Design a protein around this nucleic acid. Structure first.
Ligand SMILES: [Mg+2]
Lengths: 158, 190, 107, 51, 42, 59, 79, 245, 51, 258
RNA sequence: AUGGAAGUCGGAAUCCGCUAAGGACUGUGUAACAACUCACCUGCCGAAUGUACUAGCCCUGAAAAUGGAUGGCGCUCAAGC
């Protein structure tokens, strides 16, 4: 009757995420093909993106969920063309994302953020966007963050 | 630059008797008596307070002022030795050939003797004679452990060093051959 | 034995029980040892040692200056010449060496 | 039992792919881990593929 | 008893003090006043 | 071409990136592309090796 | 080294007349040559040397600076 | 002095703070004083204090300062002439040792109830008295050291074996497993990490943290608060008994 | 150094060559039939060389 | 390592083509909405311009890919402009004229197929026909003894000209990549080459401070053009053939006429 | 990007929150994690220190080959400077 939580990284719309799982979920009594197809069904929203999946295991069945991360949300909001990960490598995420979508991602990530305010959450998402390498409103995310801190850009409260 | 006056202090426990004459220090406690000649260092000993030994140097250089700290630590370790004692635990570990350690006490000399056999299968018997005042026992609580106790910290540590030095692996890769007798713990008897 | 057998031996059996303490103490004695080598070596070995120490001191100072300054081609060339190894490139009709040591016929 | 993490169809496909290397050699397919799952526990058509 | 660990394992070593052989020549208040005067002069 | 093949290969892949603690080489360079080509190549390699051994034994 | 138990041939501190004379001649020649490179030295030299100033640990540097400023004011008033 | 310990230069990003940190702390406290109705002084003595992050997250509408004690005392003002607000210098008598400021607009009864109900297990620091005797059983050493049953436990990592020997257990590496004595628990008694009633030292607390054994608890004790409207300081139960300066 | 630590394989003697996907029991079989010290672990590519 | 597509009227980026591991040293835009890129990661890529997705990845070269050329570059640079010196009245017929010029330049066996040639530092070239061959090269062009700097098709599509660092310009058949003749006479690395509109003549500008006009049918040095005091970096021949422009390290534009 | 790569095999960026402070990490470690450690911060303590240069005197800064030379004994708060 015990509950085990296993967190993993997976690519959406893929079956081979259970390749590493079957060494350890096998003693637990789970079916690797079943949990792989079930993970793919959960991550069918997030094609081509590395996402974090939580597995809740009780009485030898597993329930899957997708834990939202800032990097996955930003790369999904970038709206990149569909690509083959086997043939098209060394890609760069150099498109642009709007500041409204940045605030929406921050509202999504409020459940993880320890910041006091949505402005702090937005600045965290802007830093993650700067790491990813995209643009916000055609400018640098660092420049947008500096504008937010200096007061030119106003973030709505909650 | 010569410093006019420099002072150190050594507190003395209630059960310890310390006698200094001509820079020859004798410290007696519940566990026995230790003696050390400190005539190689110029120092004025005094009783600055009840239960405090004062050390002074007059018109000394920085090196002369610095030697008082060594004298302080030496006399303090003698006091600790006659009060609580010193105990070094050694562990002998082996891969294939079990190390056989035999401890005897020589009635003629009064010292302990440690005999080491079958070190990496060698047919020689290694013999180490302890310094006087050092007692050696084989521990029954743990496996393959010697215990060296005494009042003199220098004697106990040098005896442990002798046992560590005599079992040395030669002409082998020490990443592979891990055999030896090693000091595993240092502390007080009490 | 085969492949990384000493690493496997370290993983299965560890090392000698005093290895960490001996390594720490030797590293701690390195300062006294370096000064002793500077003051006690003789001859060509001492000279090579001193030149090597001079080189390491210079490189350390350069690295220190770079870490201090962490928080702060020349000639126009076309695109097909970019990222290549290009040379640095820096009346009286006099030669660069107008006078040399004269050579006698006996020499 | 596919506790290695790979599909048995993929294992059969790998064997079929490397069969041209097996000329002039003898081949024994060892089905491992019978303490977990037996060959009789398989569905009929995959048994037919292995035979 | 001792609560902290000594790095070299000689746990009987006492809690030593800093080696300042010129200790006690100048007080703290006088040095503060001299600090202010030297800062003004600089 | 052959007077510069060696320098060209070293410029493409330095010695430190090929083998060593900081090596980044993952896919090898192969003279074959398919499994059937590999089997045929192994057959010709074994035949040539035996031919060289017989020539050296004769010499 | 095994210097104490087996010392080597000693390095003599007794000078010879030939070496003393040669060293004296070489020192005189070096002095003259240094004078020659000094008289044809093309290196720039300042007209006024960089004066070190007053030490900080001098206790009366502040009143000496007061004296300097007062002397400047008096000289400006006189001129 | 030619003979000298050589100082190592740190080739890392973070530099020393200096006086700018002190001025920033002063300005932050002096600008957060007028915005809040109450200022509580709390103490966390001989505690790991990493749960103050969770306390800060839970009390998002408050402001917690956990800086230097003397700097916070000078920021509040220790004398009536230098105080920022009327009656703050009565509050500064509680600032000794490991203290923190809590500026809030909530009811003080709510704060007292929250910090009375706040309970969290914690690793003991050196100087605490051990509530129970802990003994690692002989044989194969497991990750928890015998707190959970071994069949639910996992064997301890082989990289901790030099560390455990340094902290004083005679453990050994038998075929890739850390064992106390023999693999079948022979020729060795269990290792007593601590005994009940014994004052723990840092070696024992380090062993307990390595074996994930929590022998202490985290508790924030409120000493007293100052209200901006009344301009007076109310003494609480911990502040009645704690020494003051 | 790598060549010095290579295993010695005679290409023209009696030899049993074990192949397959990872995590199927190749190292377990070789340990069970020989004296070779090849590691057996549940993760893929435990064995990265020829033993 | 990126190619950005810009909308000229607004100045914003529509697509970012990424995937190269080295600097994209040359980009071309064909008449079928394909973008061809060569890079320092030894690769030549064909991208879909409308979608921004990679279509082909050719990895045959052994060093830096310095330059790529298309069989239709001469008509794609000029669109509807030609020898008549008159422009059609409206945009639709102007686009039709440009498209029919491109298709006339790009027909191979009655089908529109753009040929691509890539010159590299591995002393060689590769000839690609992505429509009919895919990733299989038509030919490898061998013969330069040093790095190949510039490559260009002739306007009539029969010849390929190559400038190399071995002081030579070489001519190749544009259909099967077969070597024809060597143009010898420069004494320093030849940096650029440029065709005349009638495909009789190629002018090459080199590091030896000279331009040389070569008759490719005779295979000889037609004209020698000295006058630059330093290296010649940029060479162009006008589409109507009236002028040749050269520029380089001596900071002055030089124009050359018959 | 990698079979794997979670600060720590690599390439490029290197921002924000919470801050008292904590690098998109200084090293040890793992197959990868974990674990430890450093930078930085707080508490205990208690008053002067740290860095680099300059000047003296001392050591090293290259030596062969019979046994030898501050002229010799010898000299160490000098019988040296
Ligand atoms: Mg495995």
């Amino acid at each position: 009757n015990e509950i085990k939580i296993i967190h993993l990284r997976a690519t959406g719309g893929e079956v081979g995420a259970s390749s590493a799982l079957a060494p350890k979920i096998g003693p637990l009594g789970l079916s690797p093909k079943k949990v792989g197809e079930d993970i793919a069904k959960a991550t069918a929203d997030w094609k081509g993106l590395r996402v974090t999946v939580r597995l809740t295991i009780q009485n030898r069945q597993a329930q899957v969920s997708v834990v939202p991360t800032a990097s996955a949300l930003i790369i999904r909001a970038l709206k990149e063309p569909p690509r083959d990960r086997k043939k098209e490598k060394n890609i760069k995420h150099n498109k642009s994302v709007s500041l409204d979508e940045i605030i929406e991602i921050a509202r999504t990530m409020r459940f993880k953020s320890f910041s006091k305010d949505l402005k702090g959450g937005v600045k965290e998402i802007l830093g993650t966007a700067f790491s990813v390498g995209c643009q916000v409103d055609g400018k640098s995310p660092k420049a947008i963050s500096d504008a937010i801190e200096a007061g030119e850009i106003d973030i709505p409260d909650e | 630059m010569r410093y006019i006056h420099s002072e150190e202090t050594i507190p003395v426990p209630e059960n310890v008797k310390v006698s200094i004459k001509s820079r020859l220090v004798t410290v007696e406690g519940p566990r026995g008596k230790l003696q050390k000649d400190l005539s190689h260092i110029a120092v004025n000993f005094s009783v600055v307070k009840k239960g405090v030994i004062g050390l002074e140097i007059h018109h000394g250089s920085r090196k002369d002022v610095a030697a008082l700290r060594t004298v302080r630590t030496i006399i303090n370790n003698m006091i600790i030795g006659v009060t609580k004692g010193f105990k070094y635990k050694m562990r002998y570990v082996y891969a294939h050939f079990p190390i056989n350690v035999n401890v005897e006490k020589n009635a003629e000399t009064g010292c302990y003797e440690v005999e080491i056999r079958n070190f990496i299968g060698e047919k020689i018997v290694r013999k180490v004679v302890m310094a006087p005042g050092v007692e050696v026992e084989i521990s029954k609580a743990q496996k393959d452990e010697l215990i060296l106790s005494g009042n003199s910290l220098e004697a106990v540590s040098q005896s442990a060093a002798d046992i560590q030095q005599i079992c040395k692996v030669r002409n082998k890769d020490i990443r592979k051959f891990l055999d030896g007798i090693y000091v595993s713990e240092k502390g007080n008897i009490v | 034995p085969q492949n990384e057998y000493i690493e496997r031996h370290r993983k299965l059996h560890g090392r000698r029980l005093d290895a960490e303490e001996r390594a720490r103490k030797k590293a701690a004695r390195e300062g006294h040892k370096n000064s002793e080598n500077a003051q006690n070596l003789r001859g060509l070995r001492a000279k090579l040692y001193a030149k090597q120490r001079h080189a390491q001191k210079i490189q350390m100072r350069k690295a220190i200056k770079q870490h201090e300054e962490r928080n702060v081609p020349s000639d126009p060339i076309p695109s097909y010449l970019l990222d290549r190894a290009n040379p640095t490139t820096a009346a009286r009709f006099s030669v660069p060496i107008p006078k040399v040591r004269g050579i006698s016929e006996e020499e | 039992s596919e506790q290695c993490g790979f599909s048995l169809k993929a294992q059969i496909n790998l064997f079929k792919s490397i069969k041209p290397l097996f000329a002039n050699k003898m081949v024994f397919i060892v089905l491992n881990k019978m303490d977990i799952k037996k060959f009789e526990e398989l569905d009929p058509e995959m048994q037919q593929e292995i035979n | 008893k001792n609560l902290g660990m000594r790095k070299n394992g000689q746990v009987w070593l006492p809690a030593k003090k800093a080696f300042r052989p010129t200790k006690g020549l100048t007080s703290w208040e006088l040095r503060v006043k001299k600090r202010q005067e030297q800062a003004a002069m600089k | 071409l052959k007077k510069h093949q060696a320098k060209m290969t070293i410029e493409r892949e330095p010695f430190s990136e090929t083998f060593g603690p900081k090596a980044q080489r993952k896919r090898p360079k192969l003279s074959f592309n398919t499994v059937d080509e590999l089997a045929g190549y192994s057959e010709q390699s074994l035949d040539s090796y035996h031919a060289r051994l017989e020539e050296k034994k004769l010499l | 080294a095994g210097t104490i138990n087996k010392p080597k041939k000693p390095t003599s501190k007794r000078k010879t007349t030939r070496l003393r004379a040669k060293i004296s001649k070489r020192a005189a020649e070096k002095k003259r040559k240094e004078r020659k490179l000094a008289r044809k030295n093309p290196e720039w030299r300042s007209k006024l040397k960089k004066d070190p100033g007053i030490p900080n640990l001098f206790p009366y540097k502040e009143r000496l600076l007061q004296q300097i400023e007062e002397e400047r004011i008096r000289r400006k008033e006189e001129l | 002095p030619k003979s000298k310990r050589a100082r190592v230069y740190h080739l890392t990003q973070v530099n020393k703070k200096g006086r700018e940190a002190k001025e920033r702390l002063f300005s932050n406290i002096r600008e957060t004083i007028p915005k809040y109705q109450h200022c509580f002084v709390f103490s966390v003595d001989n505690m790991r204090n990493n749960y103050l992050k969770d306390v800060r997250h839970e009390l998002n509408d408050c402001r917690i300062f956990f800086g230097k004690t003397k700097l916070m005392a000078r920021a509040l003002g220790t004398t009536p002439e230098e105080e920022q607000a009327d009656g703050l210098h009565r509050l500064t008598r509680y600032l000794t040792g490991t203290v923190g400021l809590l500026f809030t607009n909530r009811d003080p009864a709510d704060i007292e109830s929250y910090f009375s109900n706040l309970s969290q297990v914690d690793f003991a620091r050196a100087g605490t008295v051990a509530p129970r005797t802990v003994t690692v059983p002989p044989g194969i050493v497991y990750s928890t050291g015998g707190e959970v049953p071994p069949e639910h436990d996992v064997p301890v990592s082989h990289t901790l074996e030099p560390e455990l020997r340094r902290l004083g257990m005679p453990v050994r590496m038998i075929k890739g497993k850390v064992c106390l004595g023999d693999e079948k628990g022979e020729a060795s008694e269990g290792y007593t990490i601590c005994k009940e009633g014994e004052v723990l030292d840092s070696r024992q607390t380090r062993l307990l943290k390595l074996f994930s054994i929590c022998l202490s608890e985290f508790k924030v004790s409120l000493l007293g608060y100052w209200s901006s409207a009344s301009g007076e300081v109310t003494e609480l139960e911990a502040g009645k008994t704690r020494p003051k300066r | 150094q790598h060549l010095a630590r290579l295993p010695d394989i005679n290409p023209t003697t009696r030899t049993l060559l074990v192949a397959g996907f990872p995590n199927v029991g190749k190292s377990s079989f070789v340990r069970s039939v020989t004296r070779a010290d090849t590691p057996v672990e549940p993760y893929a590519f435990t064995t990265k060389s020829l033993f | 390592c990126t190619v950005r597509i810009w909308l000229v009227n607004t100045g914003r980026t529509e697509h970012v083509l990424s995937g190269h591991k080295g600097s994209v040293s040359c980009v071309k835009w064909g008449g079928t909405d394909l973008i061809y890129t060569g890079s320092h990661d030894r690769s030549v890529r064909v991208w879909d311009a409308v979608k921004g997705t990679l279509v082909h990845n050719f990895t045959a070269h052994g060093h830096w890919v310095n330059h790529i050329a298309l069989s239709s570059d001469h008509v794609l640079r000029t669109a509807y402009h030609d020898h008549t010196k008159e422009v059609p009245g409206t945009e639709e017929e102007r686009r039709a004229k440009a498209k029919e010029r491109f298709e006339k330049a790009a027909k191979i066996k009655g089908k529109v197929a753009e040929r691509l040639v890539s010159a590299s530092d591995d002393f060689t070239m590769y000839l690609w026909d992505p429509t009919n061959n895919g990733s299989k090269p038509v030919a490898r062009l061998l013969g330069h003894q040093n790095k190949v700097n510039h490559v260009q098709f002739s306007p009539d599509g029969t010849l390929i000209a190559s400038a190399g660092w071995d002081n030579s310009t070489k001519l190749w058949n544009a259909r099967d990549g077969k070597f024809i003749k060597n143009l010898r006479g420069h004494v320093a690395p030849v940096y650029q080459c440029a065709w005349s509109a009638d495909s009789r003549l190629v002018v090459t500008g080199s590091k030896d401070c000279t331009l040389k006009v070569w008759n490719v049918r005779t295979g000889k040095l037609a004209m020698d053009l000295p006058g630059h005091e330093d290296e010649v970096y940029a060479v162009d021949w006008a589409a109507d053939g009236e002028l040749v422009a050269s520029g380089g390290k001596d900071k002055a534009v030089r124009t050359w006429r018959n």
